[PDB]
Amino acid sequence: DIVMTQSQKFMSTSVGDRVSITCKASQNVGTDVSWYQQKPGKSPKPLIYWASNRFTGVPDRFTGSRSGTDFTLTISNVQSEDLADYFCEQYSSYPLTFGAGTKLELKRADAAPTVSIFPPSSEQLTSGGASVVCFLNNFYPKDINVKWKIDGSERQNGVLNSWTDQDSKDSTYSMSSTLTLTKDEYERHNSYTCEATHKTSTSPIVKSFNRNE
Amino acid sequence: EVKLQESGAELVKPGASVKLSCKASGYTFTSYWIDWVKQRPGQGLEWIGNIYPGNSSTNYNEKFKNKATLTVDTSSSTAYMQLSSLTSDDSAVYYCAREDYYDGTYVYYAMDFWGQGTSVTVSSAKTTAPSVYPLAPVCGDTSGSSVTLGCLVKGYFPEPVTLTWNSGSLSSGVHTFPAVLQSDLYTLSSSVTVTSSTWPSQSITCNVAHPASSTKVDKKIEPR
Amino acid sequence: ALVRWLQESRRSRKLILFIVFLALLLDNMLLTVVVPIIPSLNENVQVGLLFASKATVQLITNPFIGLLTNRIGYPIPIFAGFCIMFVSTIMFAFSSSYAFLLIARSLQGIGSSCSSVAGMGMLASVYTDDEERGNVMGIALGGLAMGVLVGPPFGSVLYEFVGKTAPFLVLAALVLLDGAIQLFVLQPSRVQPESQKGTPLTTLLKDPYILIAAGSICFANMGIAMLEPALPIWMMETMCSRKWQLGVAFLPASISYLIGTNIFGILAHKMGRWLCALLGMIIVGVSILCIPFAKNIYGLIAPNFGVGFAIGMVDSSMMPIMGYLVDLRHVSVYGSVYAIADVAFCMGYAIGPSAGGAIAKAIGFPWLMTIIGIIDILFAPLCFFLRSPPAKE
C-alpha cells in the first residue's frame, strides 16, 4: 500500500502570499495523483488531476508540479476564499490511499490569552456535582497548555478540553477547560488554580480561587 | 445538475449494523462508478470501496472487506453501504463520490461530485436531557476593564444543541465551544465578554434549546 | 481471469498507449507484407507508383487530419483510421487488377495518416509531463520497429503454407480485435471540439526551433529509406551474395532500431535531448559512410546496427521535443505539430526508393552513401540550438 505523506497538518499564511503544499509518494506513483480541496462546511472538489492538469473552473492561481515522487500544489496569490483543507490521492494501485489533510489559516500578531476562572455553581452543588471552568479567550498562536492544581496536586483526570477554530473577525483562537469533581471531594480541598502556559510568555498565567470566599 | 444526496446523520447502538444511502440524480446512474470513503475526526481519509451500478461489480479495501458491503438499487437509483457489527471505532463521516471520465474516453481522471457526509455515531446513552448551570465571576475581584460570563451545559446525548445569549441580542464577544463526549454524554460551554458596567445594570440570560428532547431552559446569571 | 480484471478496474492512459502501439504495429505490418508480393508504363511507372502511393497520400493527408483533430477531437479520427485500414486489408485480400491494388494502397495511406497523427496528438495531450511524454512516445514508436521487423516473416510463412490471401485474411482479424479494443476504450460517436484554438500551421512552420527538429527526423529517416532498397542491388552486383543473404543482411538495422527506440525514449531525458539527437546524427552519418567499405556481409553487420541504433536515438529524442516546443512558445494544441513530424517521417519513404535508385544509376552506390552520410554529419551541429530555446511567450 503506497503511503502518501503530507508533512504539515497546519499552514499559516497571509493574503497575497504564495504557498506550497507537498505530498510525497512511496512506491513511484507516476502522475497518477489528484488534489482535492474541502472548504469549511462543504464537500471536497477536485483542483488538479494527473498531478499537473488544472480542473475546469479552477482559477489560475493553483498549479501542480511533480519532481520524482514529490508532488507540490502551489497557490500563487492566496485569498480569503483559499483557506480550506487540501489533500492528495493516488490511484496507481488498489487500495486507493489519500494523503492526510492540510489546513490553511490566517496569520496575525501574537496575543496573550485572557484567563478567567469560574467556581462551580450552587445549583450543581445542590445536585452533588462540582465543575470548575477555565476560559482561555483570545490568543493567536494555536498551541497552548493548561495545568490544573488543587493545592499543588497537579490533577490530570476528569479534565475536559474544548478548542475553537480560528475566529473569522479576529483570526484568534479560544479554549475551555473543565475540571469535574464530586461534591465530597470538592469540599475537602480549599484552593483551585488554572495555569495557562503559552508561547508569548515564559511565565504561565495563573488564576486561582479559594473555596472559603 | 449532478446530485448525490446523503442522510444527515445516523445513530446506532454498539454491536449493531447500519445501512447508509446515497441517492443519485441528474445523470444516468448505471454508467458511472460510485466510491465510498471514510473520514474519522482529526484523521485522514480512508477509501472504503467501489461499485458499478450497471453489473454490480465491487472493489473492496482489504481493511474493510469484512465490514462494508456495497449494493445498488437501479430502480430507485440509490447506492447503499452496509456496515455490520459496529463499534466505537466506526464513528466517522462517510462520503459518497462519483467517478468521471476524461472527455471522449472512458479513462478516469477525477471524482468530480461528492455527496455530503453522514455522521455515524455509536453510543448507548438513551436521549438524556441537558442540565444547564450559570457561571458567575468569583466573589470580589472586580475587574475594571471587563467581565466574562458563561453558562455550562452538561449531560445531553443528542449532539445538536443551540445556545444563544439574550435571545440572540448578544453576538459580539461570544464564544461557543464544540461539544465533547466524556461518559457517553456530551458537554458544551459558552462565554460572553461584556463591559464592566453592562452586566450589573442589565440582566443577561443564557438561552439553550434541545430539539431531540423538547426542553427550553433560560437561566439568569446573578452575582455570587 | 481477463474478463474480471478488465471489468473491475479504473481504466488508465496505458490503454490509450496500447491502442496507439497496436495501430502503428498493424499499419507497418500491412505496409511490409505487400512488398514481397507486389511483383507478380510497363513495370517502370507502375511499380514506382505502387511503392510511392501510400507514402505520398499520407504526406498529402497529414495537414488535413491535423486541423480536423482540433476541429472535432482525436477519437473520431482514430476510429476512422481503424475502419479505413480494415477496408484496405479486405480489398487487398481479394483484388487482382492493378487499379484496385493501387486504390487499396492509397486508402491504407489515408488510414495510416489518421491513426498516426491522432494517436501522437492524443498521447501528447494526455501525457503532459516531459519525462512521461518521452517514455510513452518511446514505447509507442517501437510499434513501427516491431511491425517492420515482423512483417516479411509473417507474410512469407503464410504465402506458401496456406495461400496467397492468407496474410491479409489473418491481418483482418487482428485489425478487428484492435477495433474492438478501441471501442472498449474510446467514445468515437461524440464530437469534442478542443477548448482553445491552436496556432496556425504557417506560424508553426516559421519557427526556427521546430524546423530543426523536423529536419533531424527527415534527414535521419531518409538515409535508411534510401539504403533499404539500394543495398541488395549493390550486394548482388559486388559480393554475388545469394538470395537468402539479402534478407538477413538488413536484420541488424531493424533489431537495433527496435532496441534503441525503446531504451532511448527513457534514456534521452537524463542527458539532453539535444545531445542525444546530435550524437545520433553523427553516429548514423559515420555508419552510412562506413557501409560501402564492406567486402562481405560480416563487414555489413556492424554499420547496420549503428544506423538502426542512431535513428532510434534521434527519433526518440525529437518526438517529445515536438510538443515540448509548442508548450514552451505556442498554444498547447498538439494536433498540427505532429502532422509536421509525420510529414517529415513520410518524406523519406516517399522519396527514397526512386531518388536513391536514380542516384545509384547516375554516380553509384558508394557516392550516394557518402552524400547521405555527409549530409547527416553536417546537420548534426544544428541540434545544439535546441539546448535552451527561449520561452518568448
Author numbering:
A (entry chain L): 1 to 213
B (entry chain H): 1 to 224
C (entry chain A): 7 to 46, 125 to 477
Pull text from the paper.
Human vesicular monoamine transporter 2 (VMAT2), a member of the SLC18 family, plays a crucial role in regulating neurotransmitters in the brain by facilitating their uptake and storage within vesicles, preparing them for exocytotic release. VMAT2 is responsible for the accumulation of monoamines within synaptic vesicles at axon terminals in exchange for protons using an antiport mechanism. VMAT2 is furthermore a member of the Major facilitator superfamily (MFS), the largest superfamily of secondary active transporters. By utilizing the Fab fragment of this antibody, we successfully determined the structures of human VMAT2 in the apo state (VMAT2apo), in complex with dopamine (VMAT2dop) and in complex with the inhibitor tetrabenazine (VMAT2tet) at resolutions of 3.05 Å, 2.90 Å and 3.18 Å, respectively.
The structure of VMAT2apo adopted a conformation with the central cavity orienting towards the lumen of the vesicle and represents the outward-facing conformation. The bottom of the central cavity is closed off by the intracellular ends of TMs 4 and 5 in the N-terminal domain and TMs 10 and 11 on the C-terminal domain, forming an “intracellular gate” stabilized primarily by hydrophobic interactions. In addition, the triad of the guanidino group of Arg217 (TM5), the carboxylate group of Asp411 (TM10), and the hydroxyl group of Tyr418 (TM11) forms a stabilizing hydrogen-bonded network. Within this area, Asp426 of TM11 interacts with Gln142 and Asn146 of TM2, contributing to the stabilization of the outward-facing conformation. In the structure of VMAT2apo, Asp426 is facing a lumen-accessible solvent channel, which may facilitate protonation. The resulting predictions indicate that Asp426 has a relatively high pKa value (pKa ~6–9) compared to other acidic residues. Collectively, these observations suggests that Asp426 is a potential proton-coupling site in VMAT2.
